[PDB]
Amino acid sequence: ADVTQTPRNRITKTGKRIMLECSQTKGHDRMYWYRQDPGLGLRLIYYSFDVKDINKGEISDGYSVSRQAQAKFSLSLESAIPNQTALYFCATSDESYGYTFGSGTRLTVVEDLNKVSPPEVAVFEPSEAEISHTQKATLVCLATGFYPDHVELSWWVNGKEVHSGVCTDPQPLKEQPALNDSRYSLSSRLRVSATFWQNPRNHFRCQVQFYGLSENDEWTQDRAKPVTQIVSAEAWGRAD
């Protein structure tokens, strides 16, 4: 109970067997695998009270498990499908509902890896009119043309990550809503004092961590292989 799960993030194609692993150090009899999906909370897949006991939860179909040791509880997707895309959480409990949750596994099942695509990222500089009207300056970052919907956006000002003054869209939007494999786009804002923006010494960077293909994956297209990678855009302050 340092409860640890692996992997942390994973993209897979439909039809593959995928294995998620939960380990603990405290040797609690009781271990669990849940999935989280928006609007549904955390739903139980399987659970186990000892190396000799496996029990279905509410959504066990499509999944199997193995309790290979007191310390370890394995979840498998036998043949992955897209509606298995989810955040997966394992947990242990003592004998009084004292749960310990692992930090999560974000799994995305895609039908065709040819559609995987890293974002294009651009920074848009503050309006003169905002600066004049408010004495504040809002930068906008746009990440576009990405697939699957599996990114993390951050802002960096002098090489340190910043949370203040930031707002990032909670979910990306679909570029072509009528398409099952539409690409996605995501925006963020970073607002500073017009003073801070005004300093032509200050450097601003929007960074997008993209999760895509691994070195293992075959790639047959002329375009860049769309591997897990960081894509940034930058701007400097202007005197004006």
Partner 1 sequence: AQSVTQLGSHVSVSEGALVLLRCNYSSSVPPYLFWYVQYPNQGLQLLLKYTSAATLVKGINGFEAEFKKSETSFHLTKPSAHMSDAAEYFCAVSEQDDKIFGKGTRLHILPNIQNPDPAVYQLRDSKSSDKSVCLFTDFDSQTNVSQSKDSDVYITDKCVLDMRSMDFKSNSAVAWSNKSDFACANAFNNSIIPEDTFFPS
- Displacement of CA 202 from its chain's centroid (Å): 30
In angstroms, give the least distance from the CB of 130 to partner 1.
Answer: 5
Q: Which residue, 113 or 233, has its beta carbon nearer to partner 1?
A: 233
Q: Which residue, 104 or 111, has its beta carbon nearer to partner 1?
A: 104
In angstroms, give the least distance from the CB of 11 to partner 1.
Answer: 18
* Identity at 32, one-letter amino acid code: Y
Pairing label, strands 105-110, 9-13 = parallel
Q: Which residue, 92 or 117, has its beta carbon nearer to partner 1?
A: 92
List residues binding partner 1 (CB under 8 A).
30, 32, 34, 39-44, 47, 49, 55, 57, 89, 93, 96-97, 99, 101-104, 122-127, 129-130, 133-134, 136, 138-140, 142, 152, 164-170, 173, 175, 177, 185, 187, 189, 191-193, 196, 233-235
In angstroms, give the least distance from the CB of 121 to partner 1.
Answer: 11
Q: How far apart are CA 76 and CA 69, in angstroms?
A: 16
Q: Which residue, 159 or 170, has its beta carbon nearer to partner 1?
A: 170
Q: How far apart are CA 155 and CA 146, in angstroms?
A: 19
**DSSP codes joined into one string, 126-194:** PPHHHHHHHSEEEEEEEEEEEBSS-EEEEEESSSSEE-TTEEE-SSPEESSTT-TT--EEEEEEEEEEH
In angstroms, give the least distance from the CB of 115 to partner 1.
Answer: 20
Q: Which residue, 41 or 159, has its beta carbon nearer to partner 1?
A: 41
Q: How far apart are CA 172 and CA 183, in angstroms?
A: 10
Breaks (C-N over 2.5 A) in the chain follow: none
- Cβ count near 193 (within 10 Å): 13
* Residues facing 56 on adjacent strands: 46
Residue with tokens 């999906």: 37
Q: Which residue, 26 or 133, has its beta carbon nearer to partner 1?
A: 133
In angstroms, give the least distance from the CB of 215 to partner 1.
Answer: 26
In angstroms, give the least distance from the CB of 177 to partner 1.
Answer: 8
